[PDB]
Amino acid sequence: SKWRSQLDRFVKENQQDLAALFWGLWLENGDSQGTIGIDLQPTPHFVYCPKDAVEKLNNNVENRLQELLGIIEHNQPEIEVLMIGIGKGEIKLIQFAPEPPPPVCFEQVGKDIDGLLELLEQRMSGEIVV
Amino acid sequence: SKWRSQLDRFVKENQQDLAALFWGLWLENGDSQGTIGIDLQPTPHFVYCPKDAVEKLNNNVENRLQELLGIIEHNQPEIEVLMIGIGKGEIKLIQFAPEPPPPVCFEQVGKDIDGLLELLEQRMSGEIVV
């Protein structure tokens, strides 16, 4: 269960870059691909999670995050970032309203999603271990 | 308006305590008093912002955050901390899903809301200035 607090600390230290990536992917995909996931195995990597898979997977003892589907539906990508981390099937909800908001974060980092994916995934490696 | 970034730094570094206070206030008051606000003057201090008051104050040119009212109505306090910082009439949304969730932060920090309020308020003093 320690990976949860490792993921928590990583998010805390990387909110602006995660917001830039969140917003960049929002621009390209909106919600058509589902929810941005961080699958932690075999090493942490960004994925998309269709709403079915989230419900299927929140339908599990270790999870059962109350109203998760509504939280995912009601997230406002212009002001707040939402992702889900996944370690051996258990969800940790990632949600934060950064400063500046995600679209400004995107403009201020000045990186495309490919650049942010590689930078963030390198940073995760060996920092979050399941 | 540097206070927006100082408040962002404060929240990032104090998620557990703010989560414990948020849930302690939920235990005490539920939604009977409105939304938890942080009034930044003369010193940052926690207040309650009734629904009508939030709305009137969001009805101002520096604010007009899209879907603010809906974010407030949909907040899931077992999962999500929600507060609004208020600096010279400027709203800043605070929303984040802590690790562990808010009711566990309250249990783990082992203090009542009076203790939490005093600690968090002294901490913010000097650190977030308008």
Numbering used by the authors:
A (entry chain B), B (entry chain A): 13 to 142
Article, verbatim:
In the Nos7120 genome, the ccmS gene is located within the gene clusters expressing β-carboxysome proteins and carboxysome-related proteins. ccmS in Nos7120 encodes a protein of 142 amino acids. We solved the 1.99 Å crystal structure of the CcmS dimer in space group P212121 by molecular replacement. The two CcmS molecules are rotated symmetrically, with an interaction interface of ∼900 Å2, primarily mediated by hydrogen bonds and salt bridges. Key interactions at the CcmS dimer interface are formed by Arg16-Glu111, Ala109-Gln107, Pro110-Lys104, Asp20-Glu111, and Lys104-Glu111 residues.
The carboxysome is a natural proteinaceous organelle for carbon fixation in cyanobacteria and chemoautotrophs. It comprises hundreds of protein homologs that self-assemble to form a polyhedral shell structure to sequester cargo enzymes, ribulose 1,5-bisphosphate carboxylase/oxygenase (Rubisco), and carbonic anhydrases.
